[PDB]
Structure formats: structure tokens, C-alpha cells
Amino acid sequence: KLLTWESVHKENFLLARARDKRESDSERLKRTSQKVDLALKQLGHIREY
Amino acid sequence: SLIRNLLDQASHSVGHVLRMLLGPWSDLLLWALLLNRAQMAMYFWEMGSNAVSSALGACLLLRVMARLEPDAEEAARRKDLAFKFEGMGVDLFGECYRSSEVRAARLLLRRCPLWGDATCLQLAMQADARAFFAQDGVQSLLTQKWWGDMASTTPIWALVLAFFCPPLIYTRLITFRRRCLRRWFHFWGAPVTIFMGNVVSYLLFLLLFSRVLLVDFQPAPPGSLELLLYFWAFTLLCEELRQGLSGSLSQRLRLYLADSWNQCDLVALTCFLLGVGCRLTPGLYHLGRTVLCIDFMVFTVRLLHIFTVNKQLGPKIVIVSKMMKDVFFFLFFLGVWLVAYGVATEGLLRPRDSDFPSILRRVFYRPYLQIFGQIPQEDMDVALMEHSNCSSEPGFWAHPPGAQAGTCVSQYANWLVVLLLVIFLLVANILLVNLLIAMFSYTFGKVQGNSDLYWKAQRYRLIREFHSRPALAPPFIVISHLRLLLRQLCRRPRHFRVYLSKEAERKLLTWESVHKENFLLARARDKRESDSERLKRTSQKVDLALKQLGHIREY
Amino acid sequence: IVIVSKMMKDVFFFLFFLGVWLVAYGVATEGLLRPRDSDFPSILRRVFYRPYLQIFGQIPQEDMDVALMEHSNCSSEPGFWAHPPGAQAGTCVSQYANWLVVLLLVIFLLVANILLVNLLIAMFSYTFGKVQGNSDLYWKAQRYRLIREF
Ligand SMILES: CC(C)CCC[C@@H](C)[C@H]1CC[C@H]2[C@@H]3CC=C4C[C@@H](O)CC[C@]4(C)[C@H]3CC[C@]12C
Ligand SMILES: CC(C)CCC[C@@H](C)[C@H]1CC[C@H]2[C@@H]3CC=C4C[C@@H](O)CC[C@]4(C)[C@H]3CC[C@]12C
Ligand SMILES: CC(C)CCC[C@@H](C)[C@H]1CC[C@H]2[C@@H]3CC=C4C[C@@H](O)CC[C@]4(C)[C@H]3CC[C@]12C
Ligand SMILES: CC(C)CCC[C@@H](C)[C@H]1CC[C@H]2[C@@H]3CC=C4C[C@@H](O)CC[C@]4(C)[C@H]3CC[C@]12C
Ligand SMILES: CC(C)CCC[C@@H](C)[C@H]1CC[C@H]2[C@@H]3CC=C4C[C@@H](O)CC[C@]4(C)[C@H]3CC[C@]12C
Ligand SMILES: CC(C)CCC[C@@H](C)[C@H]1CC[C@H]2[C@@H]3CC=C4C[C@@H](O)CC[C@]4(C)[C@H]3CC[C@]12C
């Protein structure tokens, strides 16, 4: 029972700090960076028009 | 949860609020508070009316319910919700005060029908909203009330000189807000005037008590001055008893048991009563004089607590209450080292005067005085005493010249005694005292900021107590006591509360609503212009652009 | 020099606190021991000046402690007196509760020489740290003023 309880709480803690890292400003900036470069590439695939 | 059980208990039966509630925006707000819906409560507060009073009542209810909470997590969430509520309330108060000083002032003493018809200040005090009391606007308002009808910007020396010279009331100086009688009553009923009268009466009491104690305290029956002092203390005890009963007879007694200087005042009066009893009974004259002498110290100490309302001393008077743990640590450490050195030297040198009081003196009192410059070097060092066979034990003794240093000390290891004195001087006069200085510095730096915040609320409390205090001085307060007894006796045959206009109520309601909506718009603009929110807005713009461009890839 | 002007509030607080405690202790000891020299200047001396000098190492231990004085019937009141050897300590002191007098001297030494002085040191340190930066800025303008006057 305590094994299951601590497993539940540890997975909650993993999810919590993962969400914190994702909502961190630097990680948001890098995600916007791989969005912008991907957009630039996908326009680069349609420049022939 | 903590809601259904309390509702069932109420059905089967702050307490008055529970009695009134049974299973427009105010109802939703209180429902969110009891259900602990943070966002719902905030929305109801920002959408409702009388926002300041509603927030203060919400903070009070959350504090009380968190104190009643059995579970730490719910208590913590409730108390942080109360903290944020107090923060938004004080921000609203500041933005309201920054526009209309007089309108903000008249908002306070408004009797809000919600929360049991309690004034906003009383709600903050019962909620211990020290952050709210620390606000500059409420500080200025309490200053004005303490200088009630007394031109709060007036200098202190002008006020005191007017106090000694009543005729100077009608002069170009000492401005204010039957004209003669109204001026007289307004000047003599001001809380600051009452404070000055009580201060001068208390200094007169200290002078009288000292004069009776030092000179006119013969075993002969008490004279005119001592009888006057007995009447004096009777008036003081009557005043204190009346104050305790005013500010449920047993319930109020338990409350008065707290506020520990009210406790010190009470113990002072009891010690004075024991002193008078011992003085009157023939046997206990000396004991009565001794206990009266201690009672003088207790009264003089209470003077310090009474005179704490000064704006430049009060924070430090609050500080010195926080130094007791530090001085207790120093006292314990010095006690241990003092036992060490005292017993060691009392063993190394063996005086023939082995009486118990003399031993308890030479072990504790003398080494204690070694700290403050009283070093009996000629009493404890072998070179400074003349050698003589003052004892029959086979050794060298060198009887010292001290009166209480022993008639015949030993000298076998007096070099070790000298070295031990050197070590004691190093430990006590150098290590311990300087360490205590350092830890005073650290604790002072830690606690001064919180002490100022506490002193704001304590000053508000003292202003309230002096406002409730009757006008007449302790020499003449017996007249006020008889007046009060008449008011209770004349009933048998039969706090600020400034009035506001009915239309002015709606006017101030609209004003505070406009200011609160402006404040909400301001904070919304601030959070929108915040960098993180700008970043999330750019993120949603960019991934929306990616999504919309994903719909034209088929081209 | 600009700083030392800002220490006046702190030293005034210390002076007031020491005044209160000094009044309490001085009157208490002046009542506990009853010198026959009850002249007003002598009382104002033994209550204020002597306890003040107890702070700076001048402790009239042989003047206030019963064990250090010789016992004598220097008064007709029914008690034990032990006339002290001091010049201004009273011609005939009393000794009924001189153990309490000694304990009260110990408490006074603990309060004044330890608590008050070290607290004053601490608050000087805090105020100095707070005000030195502003004092330098003020001293710039004050120096300009002095240069202009000279
Ligand atoms: C604030 C308090 C503690 C100050 C204490 C000072 C006290 C000790 C002073 C103030 C008034 C003084 C009295 C005034 C006048 C006389 C005249 C004469 O009879 C000698 C002593 C006697 C009777 C003084 C006794 C000492 C006295 C009571
Ligand atoms: C001389 C004997 C009576 C020892 C006690 C004297 C002093 C230290 C006592 C008497 C009144 C007491 C104060 C009573 C009330 C308060 C308010 C509280 O919020 C902080 C402590 C504080 C400020 C106490 C501090 C200690 C105090 C000042
Ligand atoms: C740290 C604490 C526990 C130390 C205890 C105090 C000790 C060191 C000292 C202080 C007073 C001293 C006592 C003084 C007087 C007497 C009476 C004598 O006929 C026997 C020794 C005896 C009984 C002493 C015993 C030791 C004593 C109690
Ligand atoms: C506060 C702590 C660290 C200091 C130690 C307390 C000392 C000073 C106390 C505890 C017992 C007290 C003693 C009690 C009894 C006597 C006998 C008397 O004839 C002279 C004073 C004298 C000797 C007292 C002096 C003060 C005393 C020694
Ligand atoms: C024995 C008596 C007369 C000693 C008098 C010492 C007084 C007058 C001295 C000591 C510190 C000095 C102060 C030093 C610093 C300042 C700050 C400056 O902006 C105005 C002058 C002022 C306030 C000085 C005034 C004079 C001063 C207060
Ligand atoms: C600054 C505060 C805290 C300290 C108290 C002030 C004291 C030291 C002052 C106030 C009255 C003054 C006394 C005035 C009169 C006399 C009588 C004279 O024959 C000896 C000095 C003596 C006894 C003075 C000593 C100093 C004194 C006692």
C-alpha cells in the first residue's frame, strides 16, 4: 500500500516539475525557436511556387 | 470536509455569523470563502460592492477558519488565500487614498451592514491585519484621531506648554478643526491630551511614592502624605479594574489575563496591597517596606510600557522584548562558567570561614563582580598578602586583609589560582560579552523590520485604549468613577463612529467602485505587459500561424 | 562627522532607557537601606550619581554591602545598622534586607553594563550601516558650501 502511495506521489512530482520546466521562460523561448525555424524550413519547401 | 460538519452542528444547535448563515455578491463571496474557492472568491470580491470591508471580513473569516482547521494543508492554503486577499485590499486602499484623502478617511468609520456591523478597523484588528495597519493612510488617520480636533501638524512643545497654561488655548497658536465650552471639551478629551495628563499624573505618583518611601515611612501611623498615596493607589486600582471589566464576566477575565503588562500592572497593585497590609500590621514593618521598595521598581518599569506610544522609541521598546532569549543564553553560559571558576578557586584556596553564606558569596558574587572591574587581586593572590601561620594545618597560609575573603586562605597552588583568574577574565570579559554584542547585532538586524510592523498595530491598540479612557486624571478620576456608577445606577429607574449621510453612502460606493475598476484595469494591463505573458502570447501567435499554414500545405 | 550627528536619536533612546532603570534601581536601594543622612542633595546623589558611576567601574561595594561594613548601634531605631565607612554613603545605613540590596545591585549590573550598552552598540552598528551612504552624498554638498564660504 505504501509502495503504491509513494509511487503515485513520485509520479505526481515528476509531472509537476516537468510542467514547471516546460513553463520556464528559457524553455518557452527554445520551443518558440524550434517553431520559428520549422516554419522557415516549411516555407523553404514552397519557395518554388 | 470542514463545511458540512459545521453546517450540521449549526443546524443541531464569528459564531454569530454561523448562527446567521443557514443551509448579492456578498453571499457568493462568503460561500466561496467557506468552500475555499480561491478564484471564485477573488472574482466575487472584484465584482462586488464595499470591496475593502468585504476583503477585511474575508481575511478575518479565513484566519479564524484556518486556526480552526485540523489539517495543515488546508490551513496553509486558507492562510495564503487570506494573505493575498489582504494584499489586494491594502493595494485598493492605497490607490483609493492616493486620490481623495477625505473620502478615503470617511470610508473607514462607515458602519457596513455586513460582517456583523463591524467597522473596517475592528475587522483588521480581529484579523490581525498588521500589513493593513502598516499602510500610510491608516497611519495618518490614526495620528489624526490621536490628535483629535488638535491640528495634528502642531508641534509637541506648543501642546505641552498649552497643557501647563490652559488660558493659552484661545491664542493664535494651537489651532483646531458655546464655542468656549466646545473648545474646552474638545481639547481636554483629545487622546493626546489624555495621554499627557496621565503621564504627568504618573510622574507625580513616582515622585510622591519616592518621597513617602525615603523619608516619611516611620513605624508611626501613616501621615497625610501616606494616606494621600493610599487614596491614590485606590484610584489607580479602581481605574484598572474598570478598564479590565469594560474592555461574560469570566470570559473577559480570561482575556484580561493576557496582555502581560496589564498582568504586570495587576501584580504591581497586588504587591502594593501586600505592602500596605504588612505596613499596617505591627510585626511586618520591615517586610512591608521591602516589598514597597520592589513595588516602586515595578511601577517605574510599567512607566516604560505606558510611554511607548512615542514614534521614535516604540520600535526599540518592542526590540528589547526580543532580546530576552539572547540575554538568557548569555546568562546561562555565564552561570556555567561562573560555577566552574568559582568552585575551582574556592577549592584551590581553602578559607577557614567555611560558612555557607560566605561560600555562596565567594563562589558566585565575587567572580560576578570580577567581570565589572571589581577584581580582589590582593584578596586572591599570594604575593599581595602577608604570610602568617593563621591555621594549624601543615601548610603556608598568608591570611588575607579582606573582610569577606576568608580569615585564613591557603597558598599551595596560588599560581594556578592566578592562572585560573586570568582564564576567567579571558572567557567572561572578552569571549562572552563580545559574543553577546555580536548576537545582539544579528538579532536586531533580523527583527527590526518586523518590529516596526508590529508597532503599527500596537500603536493603534494604544490609541483605541486611550480614546476609550475617561477624561479625568488618576488624582481626579474618582469623579469619573462616581459618574460611571451613577450612569449604572440611573439606569435602574429607567468606537469613533462618525456619522455619514445616506446619499453620501451611495456616492462613496460609486467612488470606490470606480476606483476598484480602475485598479483592476491597471493590474490587468500590468500582467498583460509582463514579459512572461508577452512570451506566452507570442507562443500562441506563432503556433496559431503554424496551424493555419498547415491548412495550405496541399497547394 | 556627519554620521555622529545622526547618532543623537540612538543615544537619546539609550539615555531615556537608562534613566528609567536608574530611577527604579536608585530609589529601590535608597529605600531598602535607610541612611540617616536624608538630606535632599545627598538623596539626589545616592539615587542618581552613584548608580550612574556603578556603570563605569565605580562600585561602592564596601558602602552598600553589609558584610564589608562594621556593625554598630549608630541609630536608636530598633534594628541592625552597621555604619559604613563612606563619606557620602550615609552616616548610618540599615541592613535588614541587604541581601536583597546585593541581589538588586547584581540585577542592575546585568541590565545596564550588559543589556543596555551592548544593545546600544548593536543599534549604532545598524544605523551606521543604514546612513553612511546618504551621509557621504550629503557631505559632498556640505563641502561645496564650506568651499564657497571660505
Ligand atoms: C522620579 C523619582 C524617582 C525622583 C526621586 C527623587 C526623590 C527621592 C526626591 C524628590 C523630592 C525630594 C524631597 C524633597 C524635599 C525634602 C526635604 C527634606 O525632608 C529632605 C528630603 C526631602 C523629603 C526629599 C526627598 C527626596 C525626594 C522625594
Ligand atoms: C521589572 C520586571 C517587572 C521585569 C519585566 C519588565 C519589562 C521587561 C516587561 C514589563 C511589561 C512587559 C511588556 C508587556 C507587553 C508587551 C507587548 C508584547 O507584544 C511584546 C512584549 C512586551 C513589550 C513586554 C515586554 C516585557 C515588559 C516590558
Ligand atoms: C552548578 C551547581 C549545581 C553548583 C552547586 C553549588 C555548589 C558549588 C556550592 C555553592 C554553596 C556551597 C555550600 C555552602 C555551604 C555548605 C555548608 C558546609 O558545611 C558544607 C558544604 C556546603 C553544603 C557547600 C556545598 C557546596 C555549594 C552548594
Ligand atoms: C545571574 C547569575 C549568572 C549570577 C549568579 C547569581 C548570584 C549573584 C546570586 C545567587 C545567590 C545570591 C546570594 C544570596 C545570599 C547572599 C548572602 C549575603 O550575605 C550576601 C549576598 C549573597 C552572597 C547573594 C548574592 C548574590 C547571589 C550569589
Ligand atoms: C557642549 C555642547 C555645546 C556640544 C555641542 C555639540 C553640537 C552642537 C555639535 C556636535 C555635532 C555637530 C553637527 C555635525 C553635523 C551637522 C550636520 C549639518 O547638516 C548641520 C550641523 C550639524 C547638526 C553639527 C552641528 C553642531 C553639532 C550638533
Ligand atoms: C543623564 C542621566 C541618565 C544621569 C542622571 C543625572 C545625574 C547624574 C545628575 C542630576 C542631578 C545632579 C546632581 C546635582 C546636585 C548634586 C549635589 C552635589 O553636592 C554633588 C553632585 C550632585 C549629586 C549632581 C550629580 C549629578 C546629578 C545627580
Numbering used by the authors:
A (entry chain B): 1120 to 1168
B (entry chain A): 471 to 483, 503 to 512, 558 to 711, 766 to 835, 851 to 1097, 1108 to 1168
C (entry chain C): 920 to 1069
Question: Which lines from the publication concern this structure?
Answer:
Transient receptor potential (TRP) melastatin 4 (TRPM4) protein is a calcium-activated monovalent cation channel associated with various genetic and cardiovascular disorders. Genetic defects in TRPM4 are found in patients with inherited cardiac conduction disorders. We determine three cryo-EM structures of full-length human TRPM4 embedded in native lipid nanodiscs without inhibitor, bound to NBA, and an anthranilic acid derivative, IBA. We determined cryo-EM structures of full-length human TRPM4 in endogenous lipid nanodiscs in apo (HsTRPM4apo), IBA (HsTRPM4IBA), and NBA (HsTRPM4NBA) bound states at overall resolutions of 3.7, 3.6, and 4.5 Å respectively.
On the other hand, in our structures, ordered densities for annular lipids are markedly reduced, with primarily three densities for cholesterol molecules bound to TRPM4 observed. Of the three, two cholesterol molecules (CHR-1 and CHR-2) bind in similar positions to CHS molecules in a previous structure in a reconstituted nanodisc. One of these molecules (CHR-1) interacts with the S6 helix close to the channel pore, and another (CHR−2) in a pocket formed between S3 and S4 helices and the S4-S5 linker equivalent to the VBP of TRPV2; however, the density for this cholesterol molecule is weaker compared to CHR-1, suggesting lower occupancy. The third cholesterol molecule (CHR-3) in our structures binds between the S5 and S2 helix from an adjacent protomer differing from the previously reported position of CHS at the pre-S1 elbow. The presence of the ligands in this pocket suggests that these ligands can displace the endogenous cholesterol molecule (CHR-2) present in the HsTRPM4apo structure, which is possibly not tightly bound as judged by the weaker density map for this molecule compared to other bound cholesterol molecules. However, our cryo-EM density maps of TRPM4 in native nanodiscs revealed a strikingly apparent density in the calcium-binding site as observed in structures of detergent-extracted human and mouse TRPM4 supplemented with Ca2+. Indeed, this suggests the binding of endogenous Ca2+ ions in the SMA extracted TRPM4. Still, we cannot rule out the possibility of other endogenously derived ions occupying the binding site. Nonetheless, the occupation of the calcium-binding site in our structures did not result in an open state of the channel like previously described in calcium-bound TRPM4 structures. However, we found that in native nanodiscs, densities for the cytosolic regions of TRPM4 are poorly resolved compared to previously determined structures, resulting in lower-resolution 3D reconstructions in these regions, which could be a result of TRPM4 solubilization using SMA. This effect was more pronounced in the cytosolic N-terminal TRPM homology regions 1 and 2 (MHR1/ 2), with the density in these regions much less defined.
